[PDB]
Amino acid sequence: SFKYESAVQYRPAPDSYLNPCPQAGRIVKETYTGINGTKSLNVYLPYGYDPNKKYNIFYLMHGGGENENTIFSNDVKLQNILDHAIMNGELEPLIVVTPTFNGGNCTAQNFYQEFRQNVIPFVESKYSTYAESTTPQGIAASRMHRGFGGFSMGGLTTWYVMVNCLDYVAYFMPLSGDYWYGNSPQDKANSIAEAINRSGLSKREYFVFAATGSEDIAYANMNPQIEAMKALPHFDYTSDFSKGNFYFLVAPGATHWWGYVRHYIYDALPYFFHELEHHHHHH
């Protein structure tokens, strides 16, 4: 069974995990209408999905030039990794949603508004998450069971989601993207700190697992931000989320490509959703 490490290291999923698994989760293409017009997304349901059980949910955003289909396309194949990891007990079953910041007036920076108003209620009123209802109250009450992450421009999306949606989301996975709000790393960290202040949340109620590659140009602006965030009292640096709430995984030699980034998800996603979980697990 999964056990937290305090300084988890980069490790790719075995090559066999990139091939289809017999215990395949179902991927459902959905279309909805929101503040940015009619748009689509994909919903990965785990193998064995039972709508009378409750699942954690992770929303995962593509990068620049991509779309809601990329992550489950032949160019990434994340579903194969998810399938194999869940089958082998490395990852607890959960719902994974791949939306898009394309369409209408939407941008990577402003997607959080559509996320709050349209995406969460649409998805979580159709599929069984810990949200008993999808009113603002129902979404907020299930925040410990909701995560957001994304790559590149989708990492930027993640940071804007964090600063504007702490009330709705507890776990964040920014991959190869920095937060564009501010003229210095301190401005950036302070903005995040101010959001945490406003939320009233404790340090045991939000968690950030950031990652990039040592040869990924995102590192240049990410690293300084991470360092500034480390200096804040709001974050306790360690991958052991039973103790702290902030980690930055840097994959040696990895470049700005989903071929690597998919493994960051393999490495990090198993770390999410255990704190205050409703199951009796030892991690």
Residues 111 and 116: their CA atoms lie apart, in Å, by 9
Residues 201 and 148: their CA atoms lie apart, in Å, by 17
**10 Å Cβ neighbour count for 215?**
15
Residues 3 and 260: their CA atoms lie apart, in Å, by 23
Residues 61 and 108: their CA atoms lie apart, in Å, by 9
The tokens 């989903």 sit on which residue?
258
**10 Å Cβ neighbour count for 96?**
26
Torsion-angle region of 176 (φ positive above 0: left; ψ -120 to 50: alpha; else: beta): left
The CB-side HSE value for 71 (13 A sphere, CA atoms) comes to: 32
Report the candidate in 119, 88, 118, 107 with the shortest Cα–Cα distance to residue 157. 107
Element (H, E) at 213: strand 207-213
Exposure b/e, 139-163, CB count within 10 A at least 16 = b = beebbbbbbbbbbbbbbbbbbbbbb
Residues 225 and 219: their CA atoms lie apart, in Å, by 10
**10 Å Cβ neighbour count for 274?**
20
Rounded alpha-carbon distances, angstroms, from residue 238 to 4, 8, 9, 219, 242: 10, 9, 12, 19, 9
Task: Report how far Cα 82 is from the mean position of its chain's Cα atoms.
Answer: 14
Q: Which domains does the chain have, with CATH numbers?
A: 1-283 (3.40.50.1820)
The tokens 């810990």 sit on which residue?
130
Find the Cα–Cα–Cα–Cα dihedral 263, 244, 246, 282, rounded to 10°: 20
* Tokens of residue 157, six digits: 């999306």
Report the candidate in 86, 72, 78 with the shortest Cα–Cα distance to residue 22. 86
C-alpha angle 246-252-253 in degrees, rounded to nearest 5: 135
Residue 116 three-state SS: helix
Resolution of the structure, angstroms: 1.6
Residue 144 three-state SS: helix
Helix-strand-coil split of the chain, %, nearest 5 = 35, 20, 45
Experimental method: X-ray
Residue 84 three-state SS: helix
